[PDB]
Scaffold this motif. Structure first.
Motif, PDB file in Angstrom:
ATOM      1  N   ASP A   1       0.854  -1.187   0.000  1.00  0.00           N
ATOM      2  CA  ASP A   1       0.000   0.000   0.000  1.00  0.00           C
ATOM      3  C   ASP A   1       0.893   1.242   0.000  1.00  0.00           C
ATOM      4  O   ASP A   1       1.806   1.338   0.810  1.00  0.00           O
ATOM      5  N   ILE A   2       0.669   2.191  -0.901  1.00  0.00           N
ATOM      6  CA  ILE A   2       1.408   3.455  -0.901  1.00  0.00           C
ATOM      7  C   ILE A   2       0.822   4.372   0.181  1.00  0.00           C
ATOM      8  O   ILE A   2      -0.293   4.842   0.064  1.00  0.00           O
TER       9      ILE A   2
ATOM     10  N   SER C 227      -4.791   4.575  -4.135  1.00  0.00           N
ATOM     11  CA  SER C 227      -5.235   3.190  -4.358  1.00  0.00           C
ATOM     12  C   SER C 227      -5.028   2.761  -5.814  1.00  0.00           C
ATOM     13  O   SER C 227      -4.531   1.667  -6.073  1.00  0.00           O
ATOM     14  N   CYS C 229      -2.715   3.908  -7.902  1.00  0.00           N
ATOM     15  CA  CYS C 229      -1.279   3.683  -7.978  1.00  0.00           C
ATOM     16  C   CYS C 229      -0.845   2.380  -7.289  1.00  0.00           C
ATOM     17  O   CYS C 229      -0.031   1.646  -7.843  1.00  0.00           O
ATOM     18  N   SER C 230      -1.383   2.051  -6.116  1.00  0.00           N
ATOM     19  CA  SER C 230      -1.050   0.810  -5.407  1.00  0.00           C
ATOM     20  C   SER C 230      -1.409  -0.425  -6.236  1.00  0.00           C
ATOM     21  O   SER C 230      -0.640  -1.374  -6.303  1.00  0.00           O
ATOM     22  N   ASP C 231      -2.526  -0.382  -6.954  1.00  0.00           N
ATOM     23  CA  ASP C 231      -2.983  -1.422  -7.889  1.00  0.00           C
ATOM     24  C   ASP C 231      -2.445  -1.224  -9.320  1.00  0.00           C
ATOM     25  O   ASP C 231      -2.868  -1.913 -10.247  1.00  0.00           O
ATOM     26  N   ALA C 260       5.072   6.179  -6.246  1.00  0.00           N
ATOM     27  CA  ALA C 260       4.594   4.922  -6.806  1.00  0.00           C
ATOM     28  C   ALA C 260       5.447   4.370  -7.974  1.00  0.00           C
ATOM     29  O   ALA C 260       5.226   3.235  -8.397  1.00  0.00           O
TER      30      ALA C 260
END
Lengths: 243, 193, 278
Positions: A1-2, C227, C229-231, C260
């Motif tokens: 998670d960022i 979210s 960017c996380s995916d 990211a």
């Protein structure tokens, strides 16, 4: 998670009457509860004694408009606030006048001691320097005439430290006091060199009580019964408050 | 001396009330003081003036507790009890107290003082029936008094830790705990060389 | 209902169905905004806990009111608060469900299916329903009128099944929470914007509320962009960055895309800066 939150904090970032009263309440609570005579809030007290003079003139000026909506609750609140504020300062000064009575010969000893780490004018208000110096002569004249006049010359000293009992009553440095462990006054815990983590995570200060050779961890946000001589440096640095 | 003997090292219960009256409380105003764009004003010096000149009837706001009580003395306010003065939250704290003999529950420092103020001055403003709130404030008062009597078996030369004890519960014990620990320290330090 | 010169009426018949009219009668320049348009509100599913109420009020309208800013509201048998948006211009009107108050009760009672609690609506001051929360087996309050509680409005984007699996006090997934704050802020900023443009302010604060409300919208979108960017959905991320308002908030989008390590998004966002500057 960022995890973004530092980017959101940098996006988010885009002295006062309410604060000074909160410092007067801190000063009054620590002064009531401590054994030492704490140093006087010199600039704070000059500020509050201005605001009481200006506000008490303002309440009288607003009462001249009432001769000529015209709702009276804000007059009632501005008046009851000055009574609440004047009480805290009266109760504060009457309390530290009581300590100058107890400690006269000790404060006189700090003032005769030219090598002292403290100047009496750091510690006392101008009106407390007045009270101290003259209450000392008024009491000294009473006993000096009434009973000391008859004593042999080496016993005429009102402040003899050399005798079978020391006549100078010092503060009880080791008094047990209740403390609430604030943490640093800034929320910024990472500044502080004394503060450290524990097991269970929670941060604390460590202090050594020298008579017992014991370390104790004062974890933030909790209440201790603790010796004042161990607390002084944390209390002067605002890390703890007396309950 | 300048200060009376019964105040020399502690606060009177009326000074512990005065300290608690300096806290913010939520209220429902029954006056609109807020002036429209299309008059006397508060001008206080110890608390935030900007909350009172902007009241609108029945939209909640926070004010300092001594103003909420002064408005509630007229019909001009109603005082919203904190979330912890609910029969749900009091009953979770009573369960916590019974479950953890070794600790006091995380009640706020002013809980006895604020309960006593609001049950007398704001008796009509509770969502729960006030006789069950008085009943649970007493249930909490009594459990914490047992835990205090257990704690006093440990008076010490060095320290105590009393984590969630209220200001009013500290203030009744102060002239006993500190006076006895002071003589235990004097008896101990006298023994040292 | 009325508020000042505005009148809002709900009509019903077997032969016409549910409908509403909205009017502004005035001391001069009388207008009828809508006349007998259909009203998208549920009638009840026609024991005495309900029937002693539906014998008294067959439509189940618990209250009908204008918000404090004069936008019509209705609270029906379905316990959902519907607010009419953009009504000053009829060809762009819509009803927004701004509280599902059954869900908002279940959420605060910690995920118990809760039958002993009912909402009773009084007014929508901006952002917040004043209401009595009634407790007991009757839906309606008694004579010593309890204080109006306050419920903050929430868009109905809370999937109860996802909340159940992540709780098994309720914690809300931070994606779901950001989706609601973005939607709630988008609808409230449009209601304020149209009020400030058509009526003018009534408290000087309203322009500073609107500035603060745009600030909560961009922070909610950036929390969704994280979210995306996380995916590593660069395409979804670029769509979230394009709806973003403040040129100064779009700097955070490029910072997140570097954090990211999605350099396609960096270049695309730089095109948005220049296009919106022009």
């Amino acid at each position: 998670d960022i995890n973004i939150d530092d980017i959101l904090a940098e996006l988010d970032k885009e002295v006062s009457p309410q604060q000074d009263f909160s410092d007067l309440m801190k000063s009054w609570k620590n002064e009531r509860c401590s054994p030492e005579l704490l140093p006087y809030p010199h600039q704070l007290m000059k500020r509050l004694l201005n605001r009481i003079s200006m506000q008490s003139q303002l309440i009288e000026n607003i009462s001249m408009g009432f001769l000529d909506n015209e709702s009276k609750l804000p007059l009632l609140c501005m008046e009851t606030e000055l009574e609440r504020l004047k009480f805290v300062i009266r109760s504060y000064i009457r309390c530290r006048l009581s300590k100058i009575d107890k400690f006269s010969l000790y404060l006189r000893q700090l003032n005769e001691d030219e090598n002292s780490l403290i100047s009496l004018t750091d510690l006392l208000s101008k009106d407390e320097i007045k009270y101290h110096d003259t209450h000392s002569l008024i009491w000294l004249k009473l006993v000096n005439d009434s009973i000391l006049k008859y004593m042999p010359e080496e016993l005429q000293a009102i402040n003899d430290t050399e005798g079978s009992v020391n006549m100078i009553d010092e503060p009880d440095w080791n008094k047990f006091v209740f403390i609430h462990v604030n943490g640093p006054p800034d929320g910024k815990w990472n500044e502080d060199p004394l503060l450290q983590e524990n097991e269970f995570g929670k941060p604390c200060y460590t202090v050594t009580i020298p008579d017992l050779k014991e370390e104790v961890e004062l974890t933030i946000g909790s209440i201790y019964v603790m010796r004042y001589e161990v607390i002084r440096d944390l209390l002067r640095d605002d890390k703890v408050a007396l309950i | 001396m300048s200060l009376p003997a019964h105040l020399q090292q502690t606060f009177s219960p009326e000074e512990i009330q005065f300290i608690v009256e300096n806290e913010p409380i939520k209220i429902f105003p029954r006056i609109t003081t807020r002036q429209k764009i299309r008059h006397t004003r508060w001008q206080l010096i110890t608390t935030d003036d900007k909350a009172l000149n902007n009241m609108v009837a029945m939209r909640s706001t926070e004010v300092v507790l001594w103003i909420a009580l002064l408005l509630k003395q007229q019909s001009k306010c109603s005082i919203v009890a904190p979330q912890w003065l609910t029969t749900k939250e009091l009953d979770r704290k009573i369960q916590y107290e019974k479950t953890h003999p070794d600790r006091f529950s995380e009640l706020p420092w002013n809980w006895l003082v604020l309960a006593r103020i609001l049950f007398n001055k704001a008796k009509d403003d509770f969502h729960d029936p006030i006789h069950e709130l008085r009943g649970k404030i007493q249930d909490l008062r009594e459990i914490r008094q047992i835990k205090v009597l257990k704690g006093l078996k440990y008076l010490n030369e060095s320290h105590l830790q009393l984590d969630n004890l209220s200001l009013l519960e500290i203030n009744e014990l102060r002239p006993f705990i500190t006076e006895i620990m002071d003589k235990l320290r004097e008896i101990h330090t006298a023994s040292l060389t | 209902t009325a508020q000042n010169y505005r009148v809002f009426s709900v009509h019903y018949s077997q032969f016409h169905g549910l409908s509403y009219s909205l009017s502004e009668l005035g001391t001069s320049s009388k207008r009828y905004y809508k006349r007998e348009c259909p009203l998208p509100m549920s009638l009840p599913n026609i024991k005495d806990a309900n029937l002693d109420y539906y014998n008294f009020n067959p439509m189940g309208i618990k209250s009908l009111f204008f918000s404090s800013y004069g936008d019509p509201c209705i609270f029906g048998s379905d316990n959902t608060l519907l607010l009419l948006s953009k009504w000053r211009s009829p060809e762009e009107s819509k009803w927004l469900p701004i509280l599902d108050s059954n869900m908002e009760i279940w959420k605060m009672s910690g995920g118990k299916e809760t039958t002993d609690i009912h909402v009773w609506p009084l007014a929508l001051a901006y952002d917040t329903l004043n209401c009595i929360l009634v407790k007991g087996k009757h839906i309606w309050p008694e004579f010593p009128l309890p204080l109006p509680s306050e419920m903050e409005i929430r868009m109905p984007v809370f999937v109860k099944s996802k909340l159940l699996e992540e709780n098994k006090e309720i914690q809300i997934p931070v994606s779901m929470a950001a989706e609601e704050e973005y939607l709630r802020s988008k609808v409230l900023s449009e209601l304020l914007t149209d009020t400030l443009e058509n009526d003018g302010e009534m408290y000087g604060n309203e322009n500073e509320v609107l500035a603060a409300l745009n600030g909560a919208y961009d922070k909610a979108l950036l929390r969704l962009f994280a979210s995306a960017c996380s995916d590593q959905n660069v395409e979804k991320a670029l769509s979230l960055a394009h709806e973003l308002k403040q040129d100064r908030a779009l700097t955070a989008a490029v910072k997140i895309s570097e954090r990211a390590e999605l350099p396609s998004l960096v270049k695309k966002i730089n095109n948005i800066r220049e296009a919106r500057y022009e």
